[PDB]
Amino acid sequence: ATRTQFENSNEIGVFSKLTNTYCLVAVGGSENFYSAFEAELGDAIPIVHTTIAGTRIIGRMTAGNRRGLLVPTQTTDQELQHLRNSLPDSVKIQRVEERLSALGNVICCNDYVALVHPDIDRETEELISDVLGVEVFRQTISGNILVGSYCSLSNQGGLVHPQTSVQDQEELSSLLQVPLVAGTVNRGSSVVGAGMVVNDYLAVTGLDTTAPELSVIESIFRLQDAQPESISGNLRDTLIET
Amino acid sequence: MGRYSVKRYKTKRRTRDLDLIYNDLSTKESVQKLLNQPLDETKPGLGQHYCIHCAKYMETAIALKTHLKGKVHKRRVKELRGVPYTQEVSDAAAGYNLNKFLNRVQEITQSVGPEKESNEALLKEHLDSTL
């Protein structure tokens, strides 16, 4: 768990993408946001400056995991060639054409089980299961249509937005096979997917994230080497006050 | 540019277009949605009596009887006979994505074609039985 801010915005998942085996950042202005990932990840995995369609918002235009990576229609051939040169030859890269272009708001995923937008086509439901190698489920989180913004995942656990019902979590945790908590990030912002990035060993959120808000994120994602998620019951007295 | 063409073909007064209308007829689920819209206050026939070919609401059920028996509505039937001219037809003409183009023409000849004609046959089976 680490507090980091893009230029003065607490929104991290808009501006950055983080998988188990690679990280993607924007090119905005100065390399202060870029080095704040290398302080935690280092030389081990490639952290790549890129743009998608000449934009900074690359955490919401792409969607991928440690197997594959998906870029939308409007990605130029230079920005597609530039990603392939940087990444090693393990990760699959494929340009996806669809009706809708925001792949970040639409495909929430871990390495293993992904959710999609309900109005997504049957042709790319094939393509997601081919590249990412994951099981695809058509689902809404409490009847919200954008699953990439209001739900974050990893192989450890997942975090959902606090308007989600108690029944809807247990119904949806059967599909994802991970523990889930209705949580808030960046002082009560419901948008929990764009608020933070997370993989199986690191979480990066904004400076507005408070000290009780790090308590749930550290617990439900099991970040330290001595946190089996059972201590979120010992953190109940913090959450009763919050 | 002119006087008459500006009055009807501004960006404000644009009709639907020929591309989407072929998609609405092509399956049996979207036909049953448009024939059975929920009634709306902001629509001319209060959200009933909608023609699918001409994207156009009619005032009264009498105004469908006199609309189908006209040379205006027999354009749009004759207009929607074949392949609906996507972007892919224009790219194939320059020597660019034939196999993307020819496979879609292969599917309209085989699959999407007789599914559309078995939908337009049922509209005349329905709009004569109710009118």
Binding site: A211, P212, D237, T238 | -
Partner: protein, 249 residues
Amino acid sequence: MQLSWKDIPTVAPANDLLDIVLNRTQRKTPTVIRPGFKITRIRAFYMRKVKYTGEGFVEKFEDILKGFPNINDVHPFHRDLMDTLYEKNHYKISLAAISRAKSLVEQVARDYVRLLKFGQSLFQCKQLKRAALGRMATIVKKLRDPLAYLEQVRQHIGRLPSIDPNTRTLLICGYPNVGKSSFLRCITKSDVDVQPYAFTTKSLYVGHFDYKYLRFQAIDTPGILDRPTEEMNNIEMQSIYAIAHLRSC
């Protein structure tokens, strides 16, 4: 509003506050008329200066009555620190004197515009302008004593610590010269003096610490001597309502 009072601009004494507003309507408004003008221009010239000065005193008075924290219905703790420290009677009387002094400026301004519309010459319209400014200066010179009191309660109310009664606090109470200041210095980050004499802290000092992912604030007391139990020093009386009202350990 709640939890803090820093947003009160100032107040000048009556020799300065009269000096500002009457200088304001000389620089802003036009100032040159001639006796050969039309009577409508000369009448509507002095109608402008009476009303504009009249609003000039009220816009300063609306900056006083809006800023001060309205001691009744704040909270029975914030009311009662200000009872011992600021003496509710002198607080409520002086602000109600200005609210009386605000409404009298509106009465003089609405009369001497209304009487001025029948001035038939320059030598008559000039005198209604001067009498309209003089009777406003009478209200200001009479208000000389409550303004100097309100300046000094403005300089002290900004420096009070920010506490919330509904939040979880803890009170540290005991005798003077015991160690309750030195306990506060080691428990949290706060600049509280640790000098070895009896009454060092004369006001409530607050420091913040964190236990189990939360926010705790530690309120220091001045330290007390009970001896008659009914009357007590105002330095010492600040402790008792910090014990009575504040619902925490």
